[PDB]
Subunit: 306 residues, 5 copies
């Protein structure tokens, strides 16, 4: 059972694709294992770079194929490099950039709690064990954060053994590969979305109610039609700029709320009026519920928070 | 007639392209067949990974080219791997990611019933038969359904024989290739579309009718012009966010319905008024059909459901 | 003069790029010619697949480079395959997916009459003649037409000789290559565009005129300003969803028509009023041309159909 | 000093990228030079195609690397081809598709005057001279210019010598390479933009002024608020469909003009009214400058043309 | 410790990707170092172009792999070239085009102060020192600037030594690589954004206040609802055209300011009216604060500039 020591260097985690639950990662992988000591020119460990590595494979030198279990597609390999030591051991170092997949829940969108994961695992070796895994999240925990879309926490390893129940034509016990699973926790930078989406959306819902502080009945009604046209014009601005998903976020709901608030008003207003014993018998208290559902909406809003 | 045993591992089905009737699939293919027993180093199965496989071909080792009949373009191959057994048999294992095509009907859009299909078939071998086909939809059913856009059911195999009537200059009986056809059934996650499209679109059509509970004639009419401007502003929000198709979905129709509901109102309102024995002889019952077509629209709507 | 027999199999024609006059085609090419009889292992045709073909070229085996004259870029080659017969003849079979160019006129957009073309031609062989050309448009002439964006007709061949008035430093007669030209006729699926664009655009132009059935002068005018704002909001919805072109389509014109219809109204209304012998002397007939240009627009529309 | 004769065949110039000042070009390059006479199988020139050319290089055959000085990225090479004559001379022919750069000024956007340029030049040869350059703009000048986005003129060559002041540690005179510079002049197809942007934008600015032919003060003002909302809704439609640039085009200004015209009106109207010696003494002449700045805008417009 | 002399030729810096903090750079790299004198066919330096270089490596010729530390992905290499001198020294020259990363702050968007950086560094050589670094920003310092999106300054070198605290299994002193760091300073071209965004946005905020110069109460209020609908329609036009970021720019704030200015007005107006001692006791001074916050907004604006 060959002992391999992996070292992942995260360089940048960017491009989150909300719909496909994808995110790009740029960094280097370093794998080290020991082989039958070798005679290296001069003596100081040998250095085989790009084109060359493929040659040394053709001459016997084995190099384990470490697949990235959760990569959509196939990584963009930069510089590959083999460092061969006289005492045997071999060190594989290569830079990569690939799109990884992972279950991502964007339900509370404006305020996300996501976790970026990597998953290394020998592509075709049952007993070729991954020794110790180390990740260098050489990123700035509290240096830059509000210049970047996401805020992090700290690296997180975890080696384990995966069992496939239908591998190759084997019975002895060939179905357990060791998988390195790295985890980086991150939280979304709310700022932008609050000050450009949540806030103004609130002032619209607020100023929505001020349709009651209108005297006439025609004014009280016809104005909610320009108010209706406003929430649509907003849901539009919201959708065209926000990340598409298969479910509704918090903002997606405030938009529905605004739609109900205005439809509610439409009913009351077209009720207070025609709930008359003469015609203009606008129920003085109902037509004046100017503080009834404006706060009765903090009751409908604190139920969406339950 | 060589016997091949295929095993398809579906890893992720994503990126549905409504217009091109395309969808991406990531997974591995495993093909097994038996050859003339071989002398393998040591004696345990041999493993040829990437660069190497191409070399063994140049030394006679035959490896059947299994084409993906319905793939738009040419798959993104990840790690290839040949496992050669001493007793002969060879096992081909490779990871792939490709865009597949298939007839897809998105007529009832908000509520889709689609089926993702794969079609393997030897690219150039008449009598090289596909033995048994197995598919591991190791996706998690009633697990993350509401975090993902599509909900599934269960795998579905089916080997068969395809006959081409104009092959290479051959007449004997060389025109029948065995094709593996895999099928995965899925249903779309309605949620988002209902609560952000169907609903508000309904409240707009509803509040649309409340143009009758207006006293004056000018109000009854000029208000449907801001109502007209609203349905357009909505069809806009809908189109910019929905998947483009060559035909109309359900929602595309609710939008047409709202256009007619408002044009209908325009006619009645500009009829009730000028259908006078004086000037302002608004047919008191017609001007008050405030419950005539609002429910007479549940008759026009239950005919689109006929 | 070598005799080659080509056979093109159209698998899918998709992705029409209106601006670049481009469209993607997936399928296989099959070329057959006869060479000096050969000794094939066993005796049955010798099947050489991918990696291998390039090798047989290095050992003399000639394989004519058949260029796709009208391909933007360079095709995506799938599986190549050489079938060598003992009696000499060689059969080349490969799958391709490429973007082809062709003059495309989208003037009558909603209702297009386009034709997808392919053009094969030896890249470097004057006297290497293309014998007979066959195309298998193995599609459903009338099976699923309303699920797909385009409707077709039937294949269409045509071999010919192209003369380049300036090729190599040759002139005896080396300037005539045989070019296979395939043609597939198709018509656009109007549906969607009619029911989501033409129709509602008409009801907007219609309801546009109902600005005359308004009593007051301020109403008659100020309402066309919300009507003006409507046509713009529509031209917007139209452009964002329609295919960009360098010229105007039919729909691009109905939008111009609506802009004139509303500007026309603006003039009449601000004329009828200030065209008085007292003040509100709205020429009792002009202010009531409620049926003057509404049908006088079917005269302006039947002149755009001239 | 080797004499090379180049021949560029322009096949299609498309995809202009306004922001990066990029445009795609598809065509073939043909380079001819003479070498030490050779023994060609048979005797008629020898034809070397794709894979093979790289082989002949490995056997001494030199082939000059001709770089495309102004190409963003690295061309998409189609079919390469070497034609070797017995009398020595060699003819290189290959098809290419690349994205070229060049200074492009889109200030007068609707009416552009651009020029597409190519620049060939030996990548590493000081005295390897480019003899005569010929370009076949076998595109069709007066063909269907109203189908294509750009209209052309005629080819344009120009060989020259470029001097680099920072080369290898060479002193004698190694710093002058011959560069072929091809130029194709083109003008944009105004049509679409005039009839879908310039025109309606004008009718909006026109009908903008008709805010003065309103009686009341509130009408005169409140209407310019729906007029304001209209210019914004238009600047939106314009931006979303027009090519993004770092500067303003003609249309970008008409939009600014419409913004000033409406802000001007806002001032006058809120001046005429409150510029009194009573309360409603709207300066009968100012409130009636209905022809003051409407033509005084053809003065503001003929100064933007000044 | 090998002495290498690098020379970077910037050809074009384009395509800034605000969200990923990416930008594309096209140019050439030239590296020179001296080796054991060689016998060059003839005597003048020897030139190995593309395909060939990889060959000379297979025959011992070492060529140091110089990685681009901050490149997202892997550069697009154009023409490679090795110039071997008889006196030993070797000159590597290759053209590249790649996407580079760097911390970019776009807080003051309309007016950016960015700096494009390159970072070369031997991929696997501890003592292979970078001698002197030179950069040719052969661009037009003033020549053209309002034709291009960015304005520059002057090149900027800086060689240094980077220490990795845990590289290979090497304890001696192998952890210091010499890194060339190039810096180019640039400022964004404000023009377009000022005249198409800042300005009209101001005129909207200005004309926003003129809602006070309205007589009635219903007018004063209902007009701010068409004013509200305007700011939204503007925030939309702004977002769809501006570069997406995780934080708010200057413009993102003017939009918030307009939202508050309008919500402020809504409060005052629905205060002046109902803050009575009868009914219409519109605090003649408050209802006439027509110059209160219009300039009291230059106080709220000069606090955002605090």
């Amino acid at each position: 059972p060959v002992d391999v020591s992996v070292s992942i260097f995260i360089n940048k985690i960017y491009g989150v694709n909300t719909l496909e639950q994808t995110y790009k990662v740029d960094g280097y992988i370093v794998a080290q294992w020991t082989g039958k000591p070798r005679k290296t020119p001069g003596d100081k460990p040998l250095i085989v770079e790009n084109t060359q590595i493929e040659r040394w494979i053709n001459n016997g030198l084995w190099v384990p194929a470490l697949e990235f279990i959760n990569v959509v597609g196939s990584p963009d390999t930069g510089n590959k490099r083999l460092m061969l030591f006289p005492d045997g051991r071999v060190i594989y170092n290569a830079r990569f950039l690939g799109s990884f997949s992972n279950d991502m829940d964007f339900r509370l969108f404006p305020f996300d709690r996501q976790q970026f994961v990597l998953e290394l695992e020998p592509f075709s070796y049952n007993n070729q064990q991954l020794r110790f895994s180390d990740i260098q999240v050489y990123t700035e925990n509290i240096d830059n954060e509000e210049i970047d879309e996401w805020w992090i926490r700290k690296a997180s390893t975890h080696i384990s053994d995966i069992r496939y129940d239908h591998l190759s034509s084997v019975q002895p016990n060939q179905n357990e590969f060791s998988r390195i699973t790295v985890r980086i926790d991150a939280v979304r930078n709310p700022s932008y979305y609050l000050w450009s989406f949540i806030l103004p959306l609130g002032l619209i819902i607020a100023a929505s109610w001020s349709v009651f502080w209108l005297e006439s009945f025609s004014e009280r009604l016809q104005t909610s039609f320009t108010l209706m046209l406003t929430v649509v014009a907003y849901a539009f601005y919201t959708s065209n700029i926000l990340p598409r998903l298969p479910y509704t976020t918090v903002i997606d709901q405030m938009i529905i709320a605004g739609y109900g608030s205005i439809f509610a008003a439409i009913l009351l207003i077209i009720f207070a009026h025609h709930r008359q014993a003469n015609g203009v018998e606008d129920d003085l208290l109902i037509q004046r519920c100017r503080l009834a559902f404006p706060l009765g909406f903090l009751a409908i809003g604190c139920v969406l928070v339950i």
